[model samples]
Each structure stands twice: as C-alpha cells, then as structure tokens.
Target: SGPVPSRARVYTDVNTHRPREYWDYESHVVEWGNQDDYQLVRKLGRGKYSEVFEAINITNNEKVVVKILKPVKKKKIKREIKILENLRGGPNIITLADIVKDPVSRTPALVFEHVNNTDFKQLYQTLTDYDIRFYMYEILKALDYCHSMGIMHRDVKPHNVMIDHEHRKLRLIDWGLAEFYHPGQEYNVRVASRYFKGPELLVDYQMYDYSLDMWSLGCMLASMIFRKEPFFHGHDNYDQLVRIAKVLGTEDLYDYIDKYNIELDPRFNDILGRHSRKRWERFVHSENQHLVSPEALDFLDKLLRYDHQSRLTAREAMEHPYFYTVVKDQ
Candidate 1:
C-alpha cells in the first residue's frame, strides 16, 4: 500500500468547515410543497429512478418540469433535494423551484424551471464548433462551482446537460447521483454511465474525487469533436476498461494499476489483450476535421488519463487554451 493516501488537487476540504446540517441529508427534514400547486401537462421522459413531466405552476402560471421519484428510498430522495439546495445558485446549475409529495401514494416530486432543450443527438448535429466550445465552457463553470462547494457530480454526461441553443443557455441537471467529496473517503465505483466510466471506476478503485467528472466531460467532448456518439463505446461494465485501454494502451493501464495497487478483475483475462496507444491525430478525418484542432486534442489528452488525480480539475480545464475564444467573450 502507498504511504500517503491520494487526495483531490483542489477544494479537498470544503465540507470540513461546513455545518453538519448542510451535508447531513438523511437528518434534514423536508418541508414538502403542496402537489396541487403544479399540474402536469405531459410526460417528458422517465429514467431508472424517476419519471419526468412538463408541468405548469398554478400559483404563477409558470412552466416547469417535475421529476417524480419512482418509489426510491426516503434517504435517496432527501439526498437529491439537499444537494440541489446546497448547489442552488451556482453558475449553470439547474433551478429547483419546489419539492412536492403526493398525498395518496406519498410519491415525492421535484419541480424545476423548465428549459426548452432539444434531444442531444438532434442538437449536436446543429451545433457549430464555437458552440461546442461555448457550451463545454458553461459545463466547466457548473462543475467548478460544484467542486468548489465540495460536491462531485458522479454522473456527468451529455444527457444530464440541458442546453437551450436559441438562448445559448446551459444548465447541468439531475443531482440524483451527486455526493459531497471528502478526502480519503472511498465511494462506490459504480456511479457514472458505462461509456463515460473513468478507469478508476472500471478497475474498482474507490478513492476517486471530483476529477471523475472531468473524465466524463472528456468523453463527451471527444465524441462531439470526432463525430462518434460514444468515443469509448463498451458493451458492458467489464468491457468499458477494454474500450479505454484499446485507445490509451494496455501498458499505461498496467502502470495505473501498479501505481494505485489495484487488482484487475479476473474476468478481463481473456478480453483484455495488449494494445498500443493510438495517437490523437489518428482519429482526425475529413468529416471531423472542422472540429479538430491542436488545443482540442491537448485538452482532451489531459482529461482521459488513467490516473484520476492526474486528470485536470474543472477550473484547470476551463483555463485550457481550447476555451480561449469562449472565455474571451466573458
């Protein structure tokens, strides 16, 4: 075992100075809003844990979205609400208008300010190179703000990001999987989606930090620039590391495991074959050439590293030269 435990490069102890009431979601008493205050118009979508709907606030005639919990644990529901309340006013963070629970079934629902967002596939087809940079910078702002507040968005992906292209507004949503970051604390490795799963996660290394989001962001950015929907496409959780290793090379994967004293799962014995690292330039083609640039490749390189601690922090990624034009506008 290593003599010293790994820690986040920035904002490692924000929770230490915070009052217990802030991070103790299980103990926080929720003041439920009246469910009758909002009327559902139509079902927008449904995820594994919740059902989403477009709705109207009867009190003020304002349009809103409601995410109804799907019979989950009370503690899980409270954690989501607490996290949203804690990250309330941060940049590009989604607005939580009210928390309501059904009187009959006792089902809880969270009301949020409605965002007119197009489906990610359809929207990405229309975004210009500059639009990608601008929106990505917007995401960085949200990530940095959350990280500064000692929160890690365990599930960062394009689907969770709401972008109103007409208004050029971006809001990072879905705080269901988010958690407060405490140094030396081991968390569940089964957090992010398979495609966006970082190496630390795939290898069962649990001492991760805010850098996990950066890896997810890198996966999203790479897919956009290269015109690949998922840059590291994997069939299952086990193959996810193989997909990453194929690009990053198996040797470097070995180096990462060695550094962290990680034991590779025996299941990967047959599927995990040695592979040489592919050059970033190799991914550039006529179709994606318009989005590919020196700075873009360099920025992506820093985020997709196997070592979680070595990955760029949200603020550091925001300062990368790839965002020079986007940041300059601000």
Candidate 2:
C-alpha cells in the first residue's frame, strides 16, 4: 500500500516558523531518569510531530509504547497534551500511564501501555465477522465515553485502533487531533481522513459536532467488514465529495437537508445537481444490504444522515440494537 497522506500538517501553521528548543546535547538519549525506567526495545513508527518506541517499563516489568513529540511551539504541544490528559482511562480507550519531559530534547513524551498486536488496519485483512463486530463494539463504547465528556476525536481510522491479542482488548489510541466540543462554536470541518469525512463537513465546512466522529466510525465499521475503504481514491476534496455522492446517491441529500434544515449551497448544486437525493438513497441502501448487519445498517443510516441535528448521537448509538445484539455477544 501507499503512504497515507499526513492530514495533520494541513491544520498546522505554515508561515512564521520558529527554532525548536532543546535542553541537552544527547537529544536521542531518553533523559530525566526515564531512560532507566524503560529499556528501549525498538521503534514502532514516526509521524510528523512525534516518534513512537516500544520499551519495557523496568519498575513494573511491563511493556509500553512511548510517544515522544518533536520540539515545537508550546501552544500546539500543550493542546495535544490536554486532550490526552482529559481522556486518561476507559475500558476501550488506551490508558496514558504517565508523561515525562525529555530534559535534553525539551519535548514531551507520552507513556502508554503497550498493546500486544498490530493495529486494526493490519488486523482487518485477517478478521472474521466476529472479530470485526467485537472491535467495532469497543470503538463505539470508547466514543460513547468521549461524547459524554463533550470531547470529539477528530481523527478516527484503522491505524488508530490497536489490538492486544494476549488480553483480547481493542484500544483506541492517538488524541493529537481531539478537541472539546463547545456549543455555538464553529469547529474546523477540515478534520479527519478524507475517505471517512461526514457530509456536513464536505458541504457546510464549519457547522458540525460529534456526528463527524460517528461518520468516521460508520466508515471504519463498513471497511472492517467489507475489506475495502468505502469512499477512497479521491485526489482532492471536490473529488472526495463526488465519490461520496456516488455511494450515497443524489436524492438522499433532500431528506438530510429537510432533517437538518440546511439550505443547499450553490456550489453543491453545480456539481451534484438539484435532484441528488434520489441517487444517494439508491446507492447507499444497495451497498448497505450486502455489507452490514440490520442493526448496524440502521445505526449507519442515522450516522450518514445529512442533517447534523437529526444524526445519531453517541449516547443514542450506545443504546442501538447493534451494540446490544452484536457487541454483547463478544
């Protein structure tokens, strides 16, 4: 597979760069006595802002994943750290055991309990129906907790969910893009993976809420079962919306517009035409029947609803029949 385009950089400021601060000369060495606390095992992965390593916590004799952030502006680092601090623990969420500042690097490192297995993206290729259902249940449960706390996980994809084969746990990791949901405040719709973005984001840009995460969840769930990303291969935002319209059909938007009470923008009409709602329902339901459970289908339908107001709430989704019937079994 190709490298997934790094979406995190899009939201960062490009102009007026500043020099990063480092405290010591041995920048690569873990400092502040944390080096002795954990024995470096291997490197896991690296992102634009952070580097992850597999290490052994000597004090407890347990393994952990240490994510060390790059030296950057304090403001951005603090915001990401705050999100991790807010979501410290939950059954389905990855626990942030502790955080330490690298004295030499002047960068923050997040210590997380190491998961034993690969991420969902890798696991999905070999998953059975039971595995997919079980994983999706844990994901939704985690999201339910976040929604109750008024937090929005702006990034949700297969790469973020980790599996622990030894313990049989599905853990949600990575909170770098998470934000608190404030009422009457416009959120940046320019968030999350393009393939899983919600219609509200593609259409109304700034007007959205927790429903955005639900859309991502729906896409992830579908991909897990179908073994393919539902809306992919778009070169840009316009292309993405076109692919989304093709899958959802054109007419579906009318009900969404009526349910959400949103006026169709002229830009949408030019591309998808006025009678788009009809096409949307036809495409969406046809694909839905072949890939999802009846209960999941119902929940997914609500998740993809055009009207953000009428879209499924995280609390309501927890009570959905899909979770009760499919998840409880796992």
Candidate 3:
C-alpha cells in the first residue's frame, strides 16, 4: 500500500472553484512598470534572492519598498507575483503596488507599500503581554485569510512579519516562498528558516498543507513568551528535529514516523537520543512567567504538535482563549 496522503482539514477545494489560469503562474506574462517612478532611498535588507530597499514614490512622494530580484529562476519570480496578486486585499497581507524590470539587465523588482517596521529583536522585548497577543492575533488573521484562500505561506517568521508597532499595525510580508495549497500535493521540504521549520519539513514529509504555517507560528510564539530568540535553537537542519525532539520527546517522534511510514535519514543514527517530553511549564520563569498562563500553555500545546493534522488550524487558534482578550483591545 502507498503511504497515507495528508490533506488540509479545511479549505481543501478552493482551487477547484477557480479557472486553471488563476494558479497557472508560468503561463502569466510579465507586465513591467516604470522603475523610474520610484527612487531607491536607502538599503533595507538583502536576502539570497533579492536586495530590499526603502524607496520613495516620485509620483506621490510616499515611501515604498523596492525588492530587486537576484538572478534566480523566472518561475520563482512568477510564483511570488502570482501569490501576491491572489492575496492582495486579504487582512494584514502585504500590498504589492508595482512590478518593474531593468531594461538592460532584465532584472525584476517588486514594489510594496512601505511598512515602518522596527526590527523584531528590539521591538519584541518592548511588547507587553497584551501587545504580544495583539500582534500574534494579527498574524493569525493573515494566516487564516491566506489559508482560506488556498495559499500556504511556506515561510513565516519574525523577519517575514512586519510590525509598525507605533500604529499597532502588522503586515505579513515576503510571499516568495508562499504556494497555493492543493490537497495531497507533495511540496518542497526545503522551505522556511531553520528555526521556524515544521517537523514535517525536517522529517522530509512532503504532503504538508497550511498547517505548516501554524507550526511556524507556534515556534514564534514559544520564542516570544519564553524570551528565547529561537525556542528550538538548532545548529543545522539535521539538528533542528533533534532540538524539537528533545522538547516534544523522541517517543512522539517515533510514533509520528511510524504512522507515516517515514524512513529515518541515516545521519540521525548517532545523534538522535532518547528524550522524554518536557513540560511547557518548565520553560516559564520569573522573567517570562508573566507571559505564561493556563490559557497560553493550552493554546501553545495544541499548535506545536508532532502530527500536522493535530495542530490547530489558524482560525481555530484565533478563537483560543489566549486571543480572546485581543478582540476587546481592538
């Protein structure tokens, strides 16, 4: 018998309602806009595939973000643009204003509405208990929206989440790794940052769905409340699962592997050790205890599960007691 295929518990048939052309990104033509309309003001950041800049819209004198693409596959550029267009108006989804290309080099650049974000390293420390819940809840809104639209934000982390804390606004940025979630589809495991990688990705389970984002969210939330930058500080991809196994336990990992009939990667033979599950309460201390509570633990427990199917869907997480107070604050 073939290994059991996993499907998203919700929004499983969203693409069925739309024409094939909607998701056929390769077939889409590039509609290039004028790059001269925006001037690069300053460097913001650079990724392996792109250089980001704070830019100014010469037409309106408004700030924007210009992300110039590196020499990557044209398919990747199309995928990002297509996903961004599909998710354009969703709550907390980053807005894409224009697509421009250099005439001589044919290098592409994406223009996005500017988000005056403070680096998460400095900003997260300043967030109160309520503030954490508020921003996290805001992330959920974006996740739920995208998931409902049959898209999985394959990369979700503090860096991809842009927060203008002064205005209490949040935008889920960087759709480059995002993909349309079709049930039973085997996706690329080499996605998301090491710290935020879900167990399925680490274990080479490719039949993952939107729930991958939930695991990333769980990792982010765990780090925030526990005062650890990366709650599972894995040195490398091989060690990532071990770090998670150390906390979530080897027993559950074994069980999960057995259920999926997954063959263990040989490199794990020496280093993977037998570890009992660590209780969530053990991480709480005087410094972070204020952020921990029964509701918080309950919510986190449901999210960071070994089984992707068992993890709380983004919408379900939003309704959890941990976020009930955030609605009133809004």
The root-mean-square deviation over C-alpha atoms between each candidate and the true structure, in angstroms, is 1.3, 9.3, 1.2
Pairs of colliding residues, candidate 3: none
Between candidates 2 and 3, which one is better according to lDDT? 3
Off by over 4 Å in 1: 1-4
RMSD of 3: 1.2
lDDT of 2 by residue, 129-179 (tens): 556666677787888777665567888877787887557788778887776
Candidate 1 lDDT score at position 76:
84
Q: Please, what is the TM-score per model?
A: 0.97, 0.77, 0.97
The true-versus-predicted C-alpha distance at residue 310 of model 1, in Å, is 0.9
What value does the lDDT take at residue 15 in candidate 2?
15
